[PDB]
């Protein structure tokens, strides 16, 4: 079971994570998610 869809940012986003062993790593924010336009990457690890 893996769900990782691209979701429209809209005005703003609230993210809540219930997790064990911190499987979720981070978030990517971009207009078109490609090299053509600048994108924001946040990766969280130990």
């Amino acid at each position: 079971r893996f769900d990782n869809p691209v979701l429209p940012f809209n005005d703003g986003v609230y993210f809540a994570s219930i997790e064990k062993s911190n499987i979720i790593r981070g978030w990517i924010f971009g207009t078109t998610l490609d090299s053509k336009t600048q994108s924001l990457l946040i990766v969280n690890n130990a």
Binding site: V6, W27, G30, T37
Partner: protein
């Protein structure tokens, strides 16, 4: 420094205003539980980029609201 049965609930708010990105976060020990939590500001970044879409990186469940 890193932000870090399911015993962990991570609440994050992402806002882009005036080219400044706001992340508000609170971590709660645990369908979302019915409770009141106020999210403290974590960091503000001058990204200065248009954001129209977002994706989540996964190496449980997550909740997205607008």
């Amino acid at each position: 420094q890193p932000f870090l049965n399911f015993k962990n609930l991570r609440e994050f708010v992402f806002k882009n205003i005036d080219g400044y990105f706001k992340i508000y976060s609170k971590h709660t020990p645990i369908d979302l539980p019915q409770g009141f939590s106020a999210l403290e500001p974590l960091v503000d970044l001058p990204i200065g980029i248009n954001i129209t879409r977002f994706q989540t990186l996964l190496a449980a469940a997550y909740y997205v609201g607008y």
